[PDB]
Amino acid sequence: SHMPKRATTAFMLWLNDTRESIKRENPGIKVTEIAKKGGEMWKELKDKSKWEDAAAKDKQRYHDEMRNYKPEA
């Protein structure tokens, strides 16, 4: 029952790949520290111009399949 999500936010999709990078940068924080100490770095991220699009692009590629999973596309 259900499965197709609807994409990840620029902050999420990056914090996802970097969330891992955050706990490494601080092997003693907390799930919530990753989300906070990441945004600070993310805001001024040069991979955000190239990653922030993953989020907006995924929102489209996902809603185009995840949302359109029933009909077709």
mmCIF file with all atom_site columns, all heavy atoms in Angstrom, residues 44-62:
data_model
loop_
_atom_site.group_PDB
_atom_site.id
_atom_site.type_symbol
_atom_site.label_atom_id
_atom_site.label_alt_id
_atom_site.label_comp_id
_atom_site.label_asym_id
_atom_site.label_entity_id
_atom_site.label_seq_id
_atom_site.pdbx_PDB_ins_code
_atom_site.Cartn_x
_atom_site.Cartn_y
_atom_site.Cartn_z
_atom_site.occupancy
_atom_site.B_iso_or_equiv
_atom_site.pdbx_formal_charge
_atom_site.auth_seq_id
_atom_site.auth_comp_id
_atom_site.auth_asym_id
_atom_site.auth_atom_id
_atom_site.pdbx_PDB_model_num
ATOM 1   N N   . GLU A 1 44 ? 25.147 28.713 2.497   1.00 0.00 ? 44 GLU A N   1
ATOM 2   C CA  . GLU A 1 44 ? 26.275 29.183 1.697   1.00 0.00 ? 44 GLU A CA  1
ATOM 3   C C   . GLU A 1 44 ? 26.993 28.005 1.044   1.00 0.00 ? 44 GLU A C   1
ATOM 4   O O   . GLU A 1 44 ? 28.210 27.855 1.165   1.00 0.00 ? 44 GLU A O   1
ATOM 5   C CB  . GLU A 1 44 ? 27.251 29.976 2.569   1.00 0.00 ? 44 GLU A CB  1
ATOM 6   C CG  . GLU A 1 44 ? 26.667 31.269 3.115   1.00 0.00 ? 44 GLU A CG  1
ATOM 7   C CD  . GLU A 1 44 ? 26.211 32.211 2.019   1.00 0.00 ? 44 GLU A CD  1
ATOM 8   O OE1 . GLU A 1 44 ? 27.062 32.944 1.474   1.00 0.00 ? 44 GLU A OE1 1
ATOM 9   O OE2 . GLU A 1 44 ? 25.003 32.216 1.704   1.00 0.00 ? 44 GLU A OE2 1
ATOM 10  N N   . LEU A 1 45 ? 26.222 27.166 0.363   1.00 0.00 ? 45 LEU A N   1
ATOM 11  C CA  . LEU A 1 45 ? 26.758 25.985 -0.305  1.00 0.00 ? 45 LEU A CA  1
ATOM 12  C C   . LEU A 1 45 ? 26.807 26.193 -1.825  1.00 0.00 ? 45 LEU A C   1
ATOM 13  O O   . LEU A 1 45 ? 25.824 26.619 -2.431  1.00 0.00 ? 45 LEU A O   1
ATOM 14  C CB  . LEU A 1 45 ? 25.878 24.780 0.065   1.00 0.00 ? 45 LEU A CB  1
ATOM 15  C CG  . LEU A 1 45 ? 26.101 23.501 -0.739  1.00 0.00 ? 45 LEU A CG  1
ATOM 16  C CD1 . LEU A 1 45 ? 27.218 22.672 -0.126  1.00 0.00 ? 45 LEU A CD1 1
ATOM 17  C CD2 . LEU A 1 45 ? 24.812 22.691 -0.821  1.00 0.00 ? 45 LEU A CD2 1
ATOM 18  N N   . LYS A 1 46 ? 27.955 25.879 -2.438  1.00 0.00 ? 46 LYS A N   1
ATOM 19  C CA  . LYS A 1 46 ? 28.120 26.022 -3.892  1.00 0.00 ? 46 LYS A CA  1
ATOM 20  C C   . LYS A 1 46 ? 27.699 24.753 -4.608  1.00 0.00 ? 46 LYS A C   1
ATOM 21  O O   . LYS A 1 46 ? 27.668 24.696 -5.837  1.00 0.00 ? 46 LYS A O   1
ATOM 22  C CB  . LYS A 1 46 ? 29.567 26.378 -4.241  1.00 0.00 ? 46 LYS A CB  1
ATOM 23  C CG  . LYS A 1 46 ? 29.826 27.873 -4.308  1.00 0.00 ? 46 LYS A CG  1
ATOM 24  C CD  . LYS A 1 46 ? 31.301 28.192 -4.127  1.00 0.00 ? 46 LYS A CD  1
ATOM 25  C CE  . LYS A 1 46 ? 31.733 29.354 -5.008  1.00 0.00 ? 46 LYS A CE  1
ATOM 26  N NZ  . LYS A 1 46 ? 31.277 30.663 -4.464  1.00 0.00 ? 46 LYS A NZ  1
ATOM 27  N N   . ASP A 1 47 ? 27.295 23.774 -3.826  1.00 0.00 ? 47 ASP A N   1
ATOM 28  C CA  . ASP A 1 47 ? 26.777 22.537 -4.357  1.00 0.00 ? 47 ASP A CA  1
ATOM 29  C C   . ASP A 1 47 ? 25.257 22.607 -4.260  1.00 0.00 ? 47 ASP A C   1
ATOM 30  O O   . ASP A 1 47 ? 24.544 21.709 -4.703  1.00 0.00 ? 47 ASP A O   1
ATOM 31  C CB  . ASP A 1 47 ? 27.311 21.338 -3.571  1.00 0.00 ? 47 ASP A CB  1
ATOM 32  C CG  . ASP A 1 47 ? 28.504 20.690 -4.245  1.00 0.00 ? 47 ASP A CG  1
ATOM 33  O OD1 . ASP A 1 47 ? 29.499 21.400 -4.502  1.00 0.00 ? 47 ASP A OD1 1
ATOM 34  O OD2 . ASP A 1 47 ? 28.444 19.472 -4.517  1.00 0.00 ? 47 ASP A OD2 1
ATOM 35  N N   . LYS A 1 48 ? 24.779 23.709 -3.665  1.00 0.00 ? 48 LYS A N   1
ATOM 36  C CA  . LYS A 1 48 ? 23.360 23.951 -3.484  1.00 0.00 ? 48 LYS A CA  1
ATOM 37  C C   . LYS A 1 48 ? 22.734 24.480 -4.754  1.00 0.00 ? 48 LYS A C   1
ATOM 38  O O   . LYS A 1 48 ? 21.566 24.245 -5.013  1.00 0.00 ? 48 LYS A O   1
ATOM 39  C CB  . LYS A 1 48 ? 23.128 24.953 -2.362  1.00 0.00 ? 48 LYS A CB  1
ATOM 40  C CG  . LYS A 1 48 ? 21.706 24.944 -1.842  1.00 0.00 ? 48 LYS A CG  1
ATOM 41  C CD  . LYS A 1 48 ? 21.132 26.348 -1.777  1.00 0.00 ? 48 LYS A CD  1
ATOM 42  C CE  . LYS A 1 48 ? 21.531 27.050 -0.489  1.00 0.00 ? 48 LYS A CE  1
ATOM 43  N NZ  . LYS A 1 48 ? 20.563 28.117 -0.115  1.00 0.00 ? 48 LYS A NZ  1
ATOM 44  N N   . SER A 1 49 ? 23.527 25.148 -5.574  1.00 0.00 ? 49 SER A N   1
ATOM 45  C CA  . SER A 1 49 ? 23.023 25.639 -6.840  1.00 0.00 ? 49 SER A CA  1
ATOM 46  C C   . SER A 1 49 ? 22.821 24.438 -7.746  1.00 0.00 ? 49 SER A C   1
ATOM 47  O O   . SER A 1 49 ? 21.954 24.421 -8.620  1.00 0.00 ? 49 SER A O   1
ATOM 48  C CB  . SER A 1 49 ? 24.002 26.631 -7.473  1.00 0.00 ? 49 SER A CB  1
ATOM 49  O OG  . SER A 1 49 ? 23.379 27.375 -8.506  1.00 0.00 ? 49 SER A OG  1
ATOM 50  N N   . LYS A 1 50 ? 23.656 23.430 -7.509  1.00 0.00 ? 50 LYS A N   1
ATOM 51  C CA  . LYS A 1 50 ? 23.611 22.190 -8.286  1.00 0.00 ? 50 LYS A CA  1
ATOM 52  C C   . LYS A 1 50 ? 22.825 21.086 -7.568  1.00 0.00 ? 50 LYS A C   1
ATOM 53  O O   . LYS A 1 50 ? 22.488 20.070 -8.176  1.00 0.00 ? 50 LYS A O   1
ATOM 54  C CB  . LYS A 1 50 ? 25.026 21.699 -8.611  1.00 0.00 ? 50 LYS A CB  1
ATOM 55  C CG  . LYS A 1 50 ? 26.028 21.908 -7.489  1.00 0.00 ? 50 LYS A CG  1
ATOM 56  C CD  . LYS A 1 50 ? 27.389 21.329 -7.844  1.00 0.00 ? 50 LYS A CD  1
ATOM 57  C CE  . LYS A 1 50 ? 28.331 22.401 -8.366  1.00 0.00 ? 50 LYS A CE  1
ATOM 58  N NZ  . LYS A 1 50 ? 29.297 22.848 -7.325  1.00 0.00 ? 50 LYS A NZ  1
ATOM 59  N N   . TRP A 1 51 ? 22.530 21.281 -6.283  1.00 0.00 ? 51 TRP A N   1
ATOM 60  C CA  . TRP A 1 51 ? 21.778 20.284 -5.515  1.00 0.00 ? 51 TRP A CA  1
ATOM 61  C C   . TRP A 1 51 ? 20.350 20.753 -5.260  1.00 0.00 ? 51 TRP A C   1
ATOM 62  O O   . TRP A 1 51 ? 19.395 19.966 -5.310  1.00 0.00 ? 51 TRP A O   1
ATOM 63  C CB  . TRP A 1 51 ? 22.472 19.991 -4.186  1.00 0.00 ? 51 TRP A CB  1
ATOM 64  C CG  . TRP A 1 51 ? 23.650 19.076 -4.328  1.00 0.00 ? 51 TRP A CG  1
ATOM 65  C CD1 . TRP A 1 51 ? 24.596 19.101 -5.313  1.00 0.00 ? 51 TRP A CD1 1
ATOM 66  C CD2 . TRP A 1 51 ? 24.000 17.991 -3.465  1.00 0.00 ? 51 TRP A CD2 1
ATOM 67  N NE1 . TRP A 1 51 ? 25.517 18.102 -5.107  1.00 0.00 ? 51 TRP A NE1 1
ATOM 68  C CE2 . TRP A 1 51 ? 25.171 17.407 -3.979  1.00 0.00 ? 51 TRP A CE2 1
ATOM 69  C CE3 . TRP A 1 51 ? 23.436 17.463 -2.304  1.00 0.00 ? 51 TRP A CE3 1
ATOM 70  C CZ2 . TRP A 1 51 ? 25.789 16.318 -3.369  1.00 0.00 ? 51 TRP A CZ2 1
ATOM 71  C CZ3 . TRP A 1 51 ? 24.047 16.382 -1.699  1.00 0.00 ? 51 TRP A CZ3 1
ATOM 72  C CH2 . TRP A 1 51 ? 25.215 15.819 -2.233  1.00 0.00 ? 51 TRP A CH2 1
ATOM 73  N N   . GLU A 1 52 ? 20.200 22.050 -5.019  1.00 0.00 ? 52 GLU A N   1
ATOM 74  C CA  . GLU A 1 52 ? 18.885 22.627 -4.790  1.00 0.00 ? 52 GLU A CA  1
ATOM 75  C C   . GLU A 1 52 ? 17.952 22.274 -5.940  1.00 0.00 ? 52 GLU A C   1
ATOM 76  O O   . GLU A 1 52 ? 16.729 22.286 -5.793  1.00 0.00 ? 52 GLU A O   1
ATOM 77  C CB  . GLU A 1 52 ? 18.982 24.150 -4.602  1.00 0.00 ? 52 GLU A CB  1
ATOM 78  C CG  . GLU A 1 52 ? 18.948 24.984 -5.886  1.00 0.00 ? 52 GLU A CG  1
ATOM 79  C CD  . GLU A 1 52 ? 19.724 24.395 -7.053  1.00 0.00 ? 52 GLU A CD  1
ATOM 80  O OE1 . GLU A 1 52 ? 20.503 23.446 -6.844  1.00 0.00 ? 52 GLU A OE1 1
ATOM 81  O OE2 . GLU A 1 52 ? 19.547 24.890 -8.186  1.00 0.00 ? 52 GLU A OE2 1
ATOM 82  N N   . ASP A 1 53 ? 18.543 21.944 -7.084  1.00 0.00 ? 53 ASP A N   1
ATOM 83  C CA  . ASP A 1 53 ? 17.769 21.576 -8.243  1.00 0.00 ? 53 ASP A CA  1
ATOM 84  C C   . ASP A 1 53 ? 17.350 20.129 -8.156  1.00 0.00 ? 53 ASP A C   1
ATOM 85  O O   . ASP A 1 53 ? 16.345 19.742 -8.727  1.00 0.00 ? 53 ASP A O   1
ATOM 86  C CB  . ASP A 1 53 ? 18.545 21.842 -9.535  1.00 0.00 ? 53 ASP A CB  1
ATOM 87  C CG  . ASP A 1 53 ? 17.632 22.006 -10.734 1.00 0.00 ? 53 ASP A CG  1
ATOM 88  O OD1 . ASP A 1 53 ? 16.776 22.914 -10.709 1.00 0.00 ? 53 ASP A OD1 1
ATOM 89  O OD2 . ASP A 1 53 ? 17.774 21.226 -11.700 1.00 0.00 ? 53 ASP A OD2 1
ATOM 90  N N   . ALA A 1 54 ? 18.088 19.333 -7.401  1.00 0.00 ? 54 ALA A N   1
ATOM 91  C CA  . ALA A 1 54 ? 17.713 17.948 -7.219  1.00 0.00 ? 54 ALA A CA  1
ATOM 92  C C   . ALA A 1 54 ? 16.333 17.926 -6.577  1.00 0.00 ? 54 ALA A C   1
ATOM 93  O O   . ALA A 1 54 ? 15.453 17.155 -6.955  1.00 0.00 ? 54 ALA A O   1
ATOM 94  C CB  . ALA A 1 54 ? 18.733 17.229 -6.348  1.00 0.00 ? 54 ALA A CB  1
ATOM 95  N N   . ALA A 1 55 ? 16.184 18.786 -5.574  1.00 0.00 ? 55 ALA A N   1
ATOM 96  C CA  . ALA A 1 55 ? 14.941 18.912 -4.803  1.00 0.00 ? 55 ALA A CA  1
ATOM 97  C C   . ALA A 1 55 ? 13.758 19.391 -5.640  1.00 0.00 ? 55 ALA A C   1
ATOM 98  O O   . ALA A 1 55 ? 12.676 18.807 -5.583  1.00 0.00 ? 55 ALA A O   1
ATOM 99  C CB  . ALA A 1 55 ? 15.160 19.877 -3.658  1.00 0.00 ? 55 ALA A CB  1
ATOM 100 N N   . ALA A 1 56 ? 13.959 20.458 -6.411  1.00 0.00 ? 56 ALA A N   1
ATOM 101 C CA  . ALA A 1 56 ? 12.889 21.000 -7.245  1.00 0.00 ? 56 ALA A CA  1
ATOM 102 C C   . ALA A 1 56 ? 12.649 20.115 -8.461  1.00 0.00 ? 56 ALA A C   1
ATOM 103 O O   . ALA A 1 56 ? 11.539 20.045 -8.989  1.00 0.00 ? 56 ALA A O   1
ATOM 104 C CB  . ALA A 1 56 ? 13.226 22.418 -7.679  1.00 0.00 ? 56 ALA A CB  1
ATOM 105 N N   . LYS A 1 57 ? 13.703 19.443 -8.890  1.00 0.00 ? 57 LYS A N   1
ATOM 106 C CA  . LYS A 1 57 ? 13.630 18.555 -10.039 1.00 0.00 ? 57 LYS A CA  1
ATOM 107 C C   . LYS A 1 57 ? 13.010 17.234 -9.621  1.00 0.00 ? 57 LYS A C   1
ATOM 108 O O   . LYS A 1 57 ? 12.237 16.631 -10.366 1.00 0.00 ? 57 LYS A O   1
ATOM 109 C CB  . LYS A 1 57 ? 15.022 18.341 -10.649 1.00 0.00 ? 57 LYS A CB  1
ATOM 110 C CG  . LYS A 1 57 ? 15.820 17.210 -10.022 1.00 0.00 ? 57 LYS A CG  1
ATOM 111 C CD  . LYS A 1 57 ? 17.120 16.965 -10.772 1.00 0.00 ? 57 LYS A CD  1
ATOM 112 C CE  . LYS A 1 57 ? 17.996 18.208 -10.797 1.00 0.00 ? 57 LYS A CE  1
ATOM 113 N NZ  . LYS A 1 57 ? 19.243 17.994 -11.582 1.00 0.00 ? 57 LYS A NZ  1
ATOM 114 N N   . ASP A 1 58 ? 13.345 16.801 -8.414  1.00 0.00 ? 58 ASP A N   1
ATOM 115 C CA  . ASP A 1 58 ? 12.814 15.566 -7.879  1.00 0.00 ? 58 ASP A CA  1
ATOM 116 C C   . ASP A 1 58 ? 11.343 15.744 -7.557  1.00 0.00 ? 58 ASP A C   1
ATOM 117 O O   . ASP A 1 58 ? 10.561 14.815 -7.682  1.00 0.00 ? 58 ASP A O   1
ATOM 118 C CB  . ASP A 1 58 ? 13.587 15.156 -6.626  1.00 0.00 ? 58 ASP A CB  1
ATOM 119 C CG  . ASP A 1 58 ? 14.903 14.480 -6.953  1.00 0.00 ? 58 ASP A CG  1
ATOM 120 O OD1 . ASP A 1 58 ? 15.518 14.842 -7.979  1.00 0.00 ? 58 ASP A OD1 1
ATOM 121 O OD2 . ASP A 1 58 ? 15.321 13.589 -6.183  1.00 0.00 ? 58 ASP A OD2 1
ATOM 122 N N   . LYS A 1 59 ? 10.969 16.954 -7.156  1.00 0.00 ? 59 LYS A N   1
ATOM 123 C CA  . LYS A 1 59 ? 9.578  17.247 -6.835  1.00 0.00 ? 59 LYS A CA  1
ATOM 124 C C   . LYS A 1 59 ? 8.715  17.032 -8.068  1.00 0.00 ? 59 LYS A C   1
ATOM 125 O O   . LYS A 1 59 ? 7.536  16.690 -7.982  1.00 0.00 ? 59 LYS A O   1
ATOM 126 C CB  . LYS A 1 59 ? 9.433  18.686 -6.310  1.00 0.00 ? 59 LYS A CB  1
ATOM 127 C CG  . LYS A 1 59 ? 9.177  19.741 -7.386  1.00 0.00 ? 59 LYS A CG  1
ATOM 128 C CD  . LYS A 1 59 ? 7.881  20.494 -7.131  1.00 0.00 ? 59 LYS A CD  1
ATOM 129 C CE  . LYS A 1 59 ? 8.125  21.780 -6.358  1.00 0.00 ? 59 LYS A CE  1
ATOM 130 N NZ  . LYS A 1 59 ? 7.951  21.586 -4.891  1.00 0.00 ? 59 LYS A NZ  1
ATOM 131 N N   . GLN A 1 60 ? 9.332  17.257 -9.217  1.00 0.00 ? 60 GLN A N   1
ATOM 132 C CA  . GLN A 1 60 ? 8.674  17.119 -10.492 1.00 0.00 ? 60 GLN A CA  1
ATOM 133 C C   . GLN A 1 60 ? 8.775  15.682 -11.001 1.00 0.00 ? 60 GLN A C   1
ATOM 134 O O   . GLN A 1 60 ? 7.799  15.105 -11.470 1.00 0.00 ? 60 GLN A O   1
ATOM 135 C CB  . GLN A 1 60 ? 9.291  18.107 -11.491 1.00 0.00 ? 60 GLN A CB  1
ATOM 136 C CG  . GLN A 1 60 ? 9.641  17.504 -12.842 1.00 0.00 ? 60 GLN A CG  1
ATOM 137 C CD  . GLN A 1 60 ? 8.842  18.107 -13.983 1.00 0.00 ? 60 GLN A CD  1
ATOM 138 O OE1 . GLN A 1 60 ? 9.351  18.280 -15.090 1.00 0.00 ? 60 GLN A OE1 1
ATOM 139 N NE2 . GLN A 1 60 ? 7.578  18.431 -13.717 1.00 0.00 ? 60 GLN A NE2 1
ATOM 140 N N   . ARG A 1 61 ? 9.961  15.109 -10.928 1.00 0.00 ? 61 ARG A N   1
ATOM 141 C CA  . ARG A 1 61 ? 10.152 13.749 -11.402 1.00 0.00 ? 61 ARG A CA  1
ATOM 142 C C   . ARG A 1 61 ? 9.429  12.743 -10.515 1.00 0.00 ? 61 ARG A C   1
ATOM 143 O O   . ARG A 1 61 ? 9.152  11.621 -10.935 1.00 0.00 ? 61 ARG A O   1
ATOM 144 C CB  . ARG A 1 61 ? 11.631 13.387 -11.448 1.00 0.00 ? 61 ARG A CB  1
ATOM 145 C CG  . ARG A 1 61 ? 11.865 11.911 -11.193 1.00 0.00 ? 61 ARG A CG  1
ATOM 146 C CD  . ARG A 1 61 ? 13.343 11.566 -11.189 1.00 0.00 ? 61 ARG A CD  1
ATOM 147 N NE  . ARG A 1 61 ? 13.945 11.802 -9.879  1.00 0.00 ? 61 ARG A NE  1
ATOM 148 C CZ  . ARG A 1 61 ? 15.095 11.259 -9.485  1.00 0.00 ? 61 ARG A CZ  1
ATOM 149 N NH1 . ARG A 1 61 ? 15.776 10.463 -10.300 1.00 0.00 ? 61 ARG A NH1 1
ATOM 150 N NH2 . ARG A 1 61 ? 15.566 11.514 -8.272  1.00 0.00 ? 61 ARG A NH2 1
ATOM 151 N N   . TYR A 1 62 ? 9.150  13.137 -9.285  1.00 0.00 ? 62 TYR A N   1
ATOM 152 C CA  . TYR A 1 62 ? 8.488  12.247 -8.344  1.00 0.00 ? 62 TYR A CA  1
ATOM 153 C C   . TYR A 1 62 ? 6.996  12.392 -8.466  1.00 0.00 ? 62 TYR A C   1
ATOM 154 O O   . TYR A 1 62 ? 6.281  11.417 -8.647  1.00 0.00 ? 62 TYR A O   1
ATOM 155 C CB  . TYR A 1 62 ? 8.933  12.524 -6.907  1.00 0.00 ? 62 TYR A CB  1
ATOM 156 C CG  . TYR A 1 62 ? 9.894  11.488 -6.369  1.00 0.00 ? 62 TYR A CG  1
ATOM 157 C CD1 . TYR A 1 62 ? 11.027 11.124 -7.088  1.00 0.00 ? 62 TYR A CD1 1
ATOM 158 C CD2 . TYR A 1 62 ? 9.667  10.871 -5.148  1.00 0.00 ? 62 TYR A CD2 1
ATOM 159 C CE1 . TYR A 1 62 ? 11.903 10.173 -6.602  1.00 0.00 ? 62 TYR A CE1 1
ATOM 160 C CE2 . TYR A 1 62 ? 10.538 9.919  -4.654  1.00 0.00 ? 62 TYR A CE2 1
ATOM 161 C CZ  . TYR A 1 62 ? 11.655 9.574  -5.385  1.00 0.00 ? 62 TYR A CZ  1
ATOM 162 O OH  . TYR A 1 62 ? 12.526 8.626  -4.898  1.00 0.00 ? 62 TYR A OH  1
#
